[PDB]
């Protein structure tokens, strides 16, 4: 009521506040045994030394992932996942160079000229024939693929 606000918290309220909340048992920081290099970081799955941060940290866990993906997965099922180039092997022009480096390396030998038809007057491609029916390829699924 009269403006006497304490510049400092009085010594009394220091003790009264500082005694309402308990000491964390861990901040005691006592250790005369040392560190347990073999066991400490490998403790039970409940309170385990839990890695965190960048994926590098999950050493003991990535191993379990591999052991896990190894477990449930039959290789039979995984065979069906195709890479892009595995699929592009069936395209009329599967692989031709792009202009940055090896543009000159491309040649008419790379052209699937038999697929379409050319007209001599226009010098262009007037149309294209059907490729689904007559494409007889011994590897519709690739060779090493064995369902």
């Amino acid at each position: 009521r009269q403006g006497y606000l304490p510049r400092y918290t009085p010594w009394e309220w220091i003790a009264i506040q500082e005694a309402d909340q308990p000491i964390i048992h861990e901040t005691m920081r006592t250790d005369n045994i040392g560190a347990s290099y073999f066991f400490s970081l490998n403790r039970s799955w409940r309170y385990k030394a839990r890695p965190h941060g960048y994926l590098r940290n999950y050493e003991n866990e990535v191993r379990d992932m591999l052991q896990f993906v190894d477990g449930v997965t039959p290789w039979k099922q995984a065979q069906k996942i195709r890479t892009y180039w595995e699929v592009r092997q069936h395209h009329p022009m599967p692989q031709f160079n792009r202009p940055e480096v090896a543009m000159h390396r491309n040649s008419a030998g790379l052209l699937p000229s038999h697929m379409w038809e050319m007209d001599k007057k226009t010098g262009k491609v007037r149309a294209v024939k059907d490729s689904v029916r007559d494409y007889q390829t011994k590897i519709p699924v690739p060779k090493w693929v064995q369902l």
């Binding site: 010594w11 220091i14 003790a15 500082e18």
Partner: peptide, 24 residues
């Protein structure tokens, strides 16, 4: 080590040089 250290509540530990508050 009490909560209120002996520096405060004591005659012999009085800081004679410590000027009072309404002076400065």
């Amino acid at each position: 080590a009490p909560s209120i250290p002996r520096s405060v509540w004591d005659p012999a530990h009085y800081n004679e040089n410590w000027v009072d508050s309404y002076s400065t």
